[PDB]
């Protein structure tokens, strides 16, 4: 659809949807967060035209990275929780978010960036990888428009945002294997 | 008994007796180690004349600190295992052992120091705290003799060893609450 519809639709969905006791507490944070990401995805123009398999494959591949972006905003200035093994994670999450906040993304930019991250996940296992890619390009097209309407003289603004993607792949490849804990 | 008997007896006992897969592996290291400490204690002249309650009370109070001393030798030069939450522990254990190794204790000195650590544990709960104290003094008496026969010009050698005790109390007070994990 039109660049304006996509921006509007995504931004709206983003606005609406978003001792060892510490480890248990962190551990159960993820369940509602993952469900928030799943609901957001459903509001992304074209996501629910992908096959069930491809939808599910993208969320599995891309949800951790989206959570890295969401934590980013939910961080701080001050900021510990090292002793649970979430040390190098939440400390990696802090440094990433610092970087992200330097861009000073508006809520529309952040919402649309977040959507770009989800559909920019690794595509190993796609039934129709081409459909996933058309969706990615649609979203990146909108993001580029948005960013250039917003800041015409910063022409590498979109470039900087796109550079967050390798970073997210790295955080993903290093920390998605961190252990959670749930009292049986 | 005589200073020579104590040194001999303790030194001998010391010589004779001494992903998440990493966390499980570390976790089960402690069980034989704790049993080694319990057997050592039984060879300490006068330990088994303390009441069962006092014996048990000392091992509970003092075994973690003894393990800190044992790890000390079983460390290295190079040296990771941060991600399990044993980060600030094994890293505290590294710095303590560095300090300990600078003294360059002989095996007799280390053996007798180790015994001093066990019986120098916090005495909250002692049926006969005076008996525990006479034992402590006996062992410190021997250690002082030993250290001064060995290095007569370093007169603060025994002083430096005694300064490891507050350190051990601190490591104890900070890290004894670290979580272990055992597959049920």
């Amino acid at each position: 659809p039109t660049v304006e519809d996509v921006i509007s639709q995504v931004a709206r969905a983003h606005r609406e949807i978003f001792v060892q006791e510490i480890w248990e507490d962190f551990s159960m944070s993820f369940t509602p967060a993952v469900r928030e990401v799943v609901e957001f995805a459903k509001h992304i123009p074209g996501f629910r035209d992908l096959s069930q398999h491809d939808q599910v494959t993208l969320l599995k591949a891309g949800t951790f990275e989206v959570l890295m972006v969401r934590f980013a905003s939910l961080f701080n200035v001050k900021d510990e929780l090292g002793a649970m093994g979430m040390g190098d994670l939440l400390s990696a999450m802090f440094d990433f978010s610092e970087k992200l906040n330097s861009l000073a993304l508006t809520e529309e930019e952040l919402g649309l960036f977040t959507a770009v991250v989800l559909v920019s996940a690794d595509r190993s296992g796609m039934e129709n990888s081409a459909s996933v890619e058309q969706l990615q390009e649609t979203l990146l097209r909108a993001l580029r428009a948005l960013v250039l309407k917003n800041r015409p003289l910063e022409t590498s603004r979109f470039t900087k945002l796109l550079l967050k993607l390798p970073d997210l792949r790295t955080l993903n490849n290093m920390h998605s294997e961190k252990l959670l804990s749930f009292r049986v | 008994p005589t200073v020579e008997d104590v040194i001999s007896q303790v030194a001998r006992a010391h010589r004779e007796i001494f992903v998440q897969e990493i966390w499980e592996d570390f976790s089960m290291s402690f069980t034989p180690a704790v049993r080694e400490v319990v057997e050592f204690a039984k060879h300490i002249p006068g330990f088994r004349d303390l009441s069962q309650h006092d014996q048990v009370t000392l091992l509970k109070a003092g075994t973690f600190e003894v393990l800190m001393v044992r790890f000390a030798s079983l460390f290295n030069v190079k040296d990771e295992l941060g991600a399990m939450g044993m980060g600030d522990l094994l890293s505290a254990m590294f710095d303590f052992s560095e300090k300990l190794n600078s003294l360059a204790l002989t095996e007799e000195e280390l053996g007798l120091f180790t015994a001093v650590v066990l019986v120098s544990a916090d005495r909250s709960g002692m049926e006969n705290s005076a008996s525990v104290e006479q034992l402590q003094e006996t062992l410190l008496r021997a250690l002082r003799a030993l250290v001064l026969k060995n290095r007569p010009l370093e007169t603060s050698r025994f002083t430096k060893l005694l300064l490891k005790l507050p350190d051990l109390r601190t490591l104890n007070n900070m890290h004894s609450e670290k979580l272990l994990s055992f597959r049920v």
Partner: peptide, 21 residues
């Protein structure tokens, strides 16, 4: 007792459970 589960495996479980509801 506790269930120890990787952050990645928890994510797939929740996605799977969410799509089966």
């Amino acid at each position: 007792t506790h269930r120890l589960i990787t952050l990645a495996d928890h994510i797939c479980q929740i996605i799977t459970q969410d799509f089966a509801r």
